[PDB]
Amino acid sequence: XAXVXAXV
Amino acid sequence: TXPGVTXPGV
DNA sequence: AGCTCGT
DNA sequence: ACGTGCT
Ligand SMILES: *C(=O)c1cnc2ccccc2n1
Ligand SMILES: *C(=O)c1cnc2ccccc2n1
Ligand SMILES: [Cl-]
Ligand SMILES: [Zn+2]
Ligand SMILES: [Zn+2]
Ligand SMILES: [Zn+2]
Numbered sequence: 001x002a003x004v005x006a007x008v
Numbered sequence: 009t010x011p012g013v014t015x016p017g018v
Numbered sequence: 019a020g021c022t023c024g025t
Numbered sequence: 026a027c028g029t030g031c032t
Contacts, residue, residue, distance in 0.1 A: 001017050001029025005025025008017050008029085009020040012032035016021035 001008065009016060 002027035006023035008023040
């Protein structure tokens with residue numbers, strides 16, 4: 001849920 | 009999920 | 019109750 | 026170095 005590297 | 013049963017995700 | 023990735 | 030979004 002976070003998008004800090006993936007943003008899922 | 010869904011909604012319902014968002015996504016995932018969002 | 020109901021889930022998911024890496025830049 | 027980080028949790029998200031309604032039925
Ligand atoms: C989004 O909040 C979120 C939280 N945990 C995870 C674990 C593994 C892959 C993706 C994820 N996304
Ligand atoms: C994005 O690819 C990414 C990768 N590793 C992490 C570890 C801890 C917090 C955030 C992260 N983001
Ligand atoms: Cl991981
Ligand atoms: Zn509830
Ligand atoms: Zn990882
Ligand atoms: Zn976590």
